[PDB]
């Protein structure tokens, strides 16, 4: 109400004493806990812990990955978290040399359950997946406790280092010849309908495009080969009703200039991967198109 009250600048939390400190200031009683500076008080990024089976910790131990949840008809586990690298054995896009490489790393029996579950169902793969975020600060153990990001930049605690996002080279492609100053990262799944079985076909795709209309127009370019298949399957198989030639969804955005190629190193085997740098997370739901 006072004219000085509207004169005041917006309040500065950092100038103010910490809430734990303030109650101690009223009693003037020191405690063993160091309340002088609470950690994670400044992070815009939001996170949530994910318990994980020990057999899927590999590759994720390097900071920067993709945890997509996988629903299952089993009553336990009801949701087996899946690394994108674990999904590479399933994707048709991966080279047979690259596929044989990481597949040897997934010798764990807990990882073996994942491939068994993708195949048994009739439902399409994109319906069973759900994007969550990215790895940082792996706990490592019989039950790993990853601190997956929900919306914000990956980085080490106390801002000491900004974690890069890792993406396999086979799944990455560039539609534009000249990068823009900004480009959103759209995770994409495109089926290639055929006959005995519908293979997937993962393609993470950075693009300067933001609007949904122009984004799915360029997607109709190289993916038109599946578009001829999805229609040809319709005249071929009455009663059968294939749906969704592909799916697009936002994953985040990057500064484009910081991007450069790299390679992960785990279990002796190397694997070249595209390396997004300052990848702010911005989750986007799956969007169907034909």
């Amino acid at each position: 109400m006072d004219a000085r009250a509207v004169a005041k600048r917006p309040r500065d939390p950092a100038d103010e004493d910490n809430e734990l400190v303030t109650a101690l200031k009223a009693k003037r009683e020191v405690n063993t806990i160091s309340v002088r500076y609470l950690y994670h008080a400044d992070h815009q990024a939001l996170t949530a812990r994910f318990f994980v089976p020990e057999g899927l910790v590999e590759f994720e131990a390097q900071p920067g990955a993709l945890l997509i949840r996988m629903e299952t008809g089993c009553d336990s586990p009801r949701h087996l978290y899946i690394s994108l690298y674990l999904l590479g054995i399933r994707a048709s896009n991966v080279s047979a040399s690259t596929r044989c490489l990481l597949e040897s790393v997934y010798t764990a029996s807990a990882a073996r359950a994942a491939l068994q579950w993708l195949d048994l169902g009739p439902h399409l793969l994109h319906r069973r997946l759900e994007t969550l975020g990215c790895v940082k600060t792996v706990s490592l153990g019989i039950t790993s406790l990853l601190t997956c990001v929900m919306r914000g930049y990956l980085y080490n605690t106390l801002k000491t280092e900004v974690f890069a996002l890792m993406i396999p080279k086979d799944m990455y492609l560039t539609w534009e010849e000249t990068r823009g100053r900004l480009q959103y990262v759209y995770l994409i799944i495109v089926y290639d309908y055929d006959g005995p079985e519908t293979r997937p076909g993962i393609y993470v795709l950075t693009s300067s495009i933001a609007h949904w209309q122009t984004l799915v127009d360029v997607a109709r370019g190289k993916f038109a080969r599946e578009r001829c298949s999805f229609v040809n399957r319709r005249i071929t198989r009455p009663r059968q009703i294939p749906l969704c030639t592909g799916v697009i969804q936002k994953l985040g955005w990057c500064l484009a200039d910081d991007i450069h190629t790299s390679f992960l190193v785990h279990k002796e085997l190397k694997l070249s991967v595209v390396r997004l740098d300052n990848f702010s997370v911005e989750l986007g739901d799956f969007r169907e198109f034909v």
Binding site: I241, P242, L243, C244, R287, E288, F289, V290
Partner: peptide, 15 residues
């Protein structure tokens, strides 16, 4: 089978 046909129809009206 009827409801499964409707799901593909929603892909069209979302397009």
């Amino acid at each position: 089978d009827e409801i499964a046909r409707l799901s593909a129809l929603f892909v069209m009206l979302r397009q």
